[PDB]
Amino acid sequence: RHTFVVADATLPDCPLVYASEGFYAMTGYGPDEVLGHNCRFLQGEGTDPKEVQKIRDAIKKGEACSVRLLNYRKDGTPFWNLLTVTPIKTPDGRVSKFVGVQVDVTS
Template sequence: MALEISKIMDRAVSSTAEGITLSDISSPEQPLVYVNGSFERMTGYGKDELLGKNCRFLQGKETDKNEVAKIRNAINLRQNCTVELVNYKKNGEKFWNRLTVSPVSLPEDATQYYVGVQCDITDIKVAQKKITDYSLKLEQKNESIKNALQGFNATIGRAMYNASSTSKRLAEKEISADREVAKMLAKINEATESVNDLILNLRAALVHLGGADRLHNIDLVNFKVLRNSPDTKR
């Protein structure tokens, strides 16, 4: 029965989609003593090219040395460890490898081997980078929109402030009794209401885009025709 289970385990390890390796850490070079077919396909190397070598030959210029140090430290302490690092295939193509290493304890209470489980997560990393790049572009686009809205808000605010000042000066000079001037002021009042609504909408858009902290302090304008102005409808 034990022999049958052993054969089943051998078949299971050989059939799994993850790359499985076994390293002899009792040797100074900690060479590979077993690799399954998935690891061969993942790296592009044949079994005869892998056995007897340390896995470090899969490393390259983009391999994070800090992640490699984590593996080395875990083995020295006889601990489990999971890292994500760039490795290189036989043809030079790089791939992202999620590697988990675990000590294999023997009956003699000595750790001679380490099992490594490797998973190619290149597609996940590529997708994550696309999401990050898209988010950055979206943030930049939103920033451009905020700047445009802020500039528009400021321009309208200044123009309407000037118009408001003119209206007030006309009222102070008591020339609003003139029918034509009264009509002009009434039209300004009507236009101002529309512009005020536009400014409010612009401010709401800026708040939605996160630009509220940089809003220009421009008050809404209110034009008032003097109470003693002639009725423009007469």
């Protein structure tokens, strides 16, 4: 199982512009509270700041990244998210969108 989202790299904070049907179902949020916002709303006090830093750098460098984060649902309950980010580039070498595949690997 996996979910899928899209971020807009032309905007400075990479706001999500499209989320799959499982993303809203897995996390507990709805489009009205997801679109236009950075994905970071899923994090909490248990999220490893070293792992978050890896995604922050790969987004600035415009390269791919894969991390294991402790994300939280809308009801505060935790789940473990195997996140993979991939830069989508235009022909001129510039990054237009970031794409994310989230897998709930809490087992």
